[PDB]
Write a protein that binds this ligand. Sequence first.
Ligand code: HEM
Ligand SMILES: C[C@]12CC[C@H]3[C@@H](CCC4=CC(=O)CC[C@@]43C)[C@@H]1CC[C@@H]2O
Length: 400
Amino acid sequence: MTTRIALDPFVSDLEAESAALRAAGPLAAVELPGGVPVWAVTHHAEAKKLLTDPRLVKDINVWGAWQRGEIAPDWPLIGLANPGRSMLTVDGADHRRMRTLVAQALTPRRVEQMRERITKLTEELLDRLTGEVVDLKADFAYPLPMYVVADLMGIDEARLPRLGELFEKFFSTQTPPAEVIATLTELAGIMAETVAAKRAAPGDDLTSALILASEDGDHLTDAEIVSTLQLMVAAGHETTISLIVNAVVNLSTHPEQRALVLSGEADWSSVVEETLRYSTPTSHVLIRFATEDVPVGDKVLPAGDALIVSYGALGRDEAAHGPTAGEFDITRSTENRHISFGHGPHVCPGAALSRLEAGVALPALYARFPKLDLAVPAAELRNKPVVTQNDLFELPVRLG
Ligand code: HEM
Ligand SMILES: C[C@]12CC[C@H]3[C@@H](CCC4=CC(=O)CC[C@@]43C)[C@@H]1CC[C@@H]2O
């Protein structure tokens, strides 16, 4: 068998865990919180190969352990491992069917149309900051992407506080099993009430457009629209928030590079792209399954086994980025673009939106508060117990 790395449910030392995963790769055996063994791809080149390999599918019917009844229905990760049917959980024909309209709404041109609104919201959130020291996550980095995605999907703003409480339970490794299914049921309920509303009273949002497209069949069922809405709201906020948080942390801990960006010697896109490579919001993505045995390095991923993609660990792969891969350097040149938005047919359709949001938020923040810095030592920052995401509990900032 294998060396098997149990991922820390409390995310106490992500840097060490990522390094261990690289050391064990390209195909590392891991244990997910809750005791579930899977494989992880932890090197850049091998991940790109597996992300485009037709033997590595989203279809959970390929999962041996699932078919054998080994996966608890109240596993806290069950909402990531077995979400409702959407573009996320299919390949090929059905993937094109389920992705096309959403992806079309998020092209660079269509995102550029959102710039004014995103900019106005960014500036309003900066206007509302109160006190010398703020939790910049709760007061800025969290609300901007949640308001953007909620508006895109037709979600009533009045529901956002409750959605925030449900996502906290969805993501936490520490949510009691007895609360797991109820959280999933209530989240699905909010998305279903949103679909019902936009069917009755269609607007200019993407949910309204999905419904109006699927009227004369061949497009998405209501159940698929509900799952798609949950996928969009979750994917669109969780990650973008951590991108903005991690960019501020990285500039605060690398003040010589912050000085380059504030003086115009480096551009804000370089900060966003290096944050995505060095410190991706998404440490791991669940989940793919092998239809056949697949060689990965000197190991075999057996048919019916599962694969997570360890974007966090592979972002610092020295084979891809050279001997400085383990450092934050907005000036780097790499022969290999990061793959923190994925690769192959499932590559993130929201990448342009996330880049616009961070690309507006970060210069706006530092234009308002040029002297902003962490209000605590960087070593006091703490990851939330969210094994797939690189999310902090808070971002204490002295605004200046
Ligand atoms: C920094 C922010 C983001 C990061 C790091 C990120 C990362 C990713 C990654 C890595 C994938 C592919 C996972 C894989 O196949 O292994 C993905 C898929 C997805 N992302 Fe993003 N994402 C971000 C922002 C967004 C936003 C803003 C939206 C929506 C508005 C979004 C919507 C989605 C959807 C719908 C998928 C599924 C695509 C499919 O499976 O065909 N993401 N994202
Ligand atoms: C599963 C899910 C859709 C896919 C999301 C997931 C949150 C984590 C996540 C982060 C990524 O970078 C890719 C998309 C995913 C994997 C969402 C939580 C609820 C939603 O149904």
